Structure 1
Amino acid sequence: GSIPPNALQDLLRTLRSPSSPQQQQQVLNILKSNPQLMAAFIKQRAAKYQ
């Protein structure tokens, strides 16, 4: 058994999509919209103050 969800991929897919630094503004809002991704992502993002 090894198959990730499709919904979670959509959220992260946003911040993953190769777009200008401007679109990044959307990523922030997406982070919160991502559960399992929030915890993991926090590692790098939240690391901003680590």
Structure 2
Amino acid sequence: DLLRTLKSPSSPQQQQQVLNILKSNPQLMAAFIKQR
């Protein structure tokens, strides 16, 4: 649901790297959820 806000097309490598940062930083995930 957060990756829907990734409007730019991207490589699988960039996407996995975003997902890894999100998974490692649940407080960043929470901040993205909160601004919705």
Aligned residues: 36
Normalization by structure 1: what TM-score? Answer: 0.32
Identical positions, percent = 97
Unaligned residue ranges in structure 2 (runs of 5+): none
Unaligned residue ranges in structure 1 (runs of 5+): 1-9, 46-50
CA-based RMSD: 6.4
**Which runs of 4 or more aligned residues in structure 1 lie more than 4 Å from their structure 2 counterparts after TM superposition?**
10-21
CA positional deviation for 1:31:
0.4
Normalization by structure 2: what TM-score? Answer: 0.36
Normalized per residue, the structure richer in helix is 2
Higher relative contact order (CA 8 A, sep 6+): 2
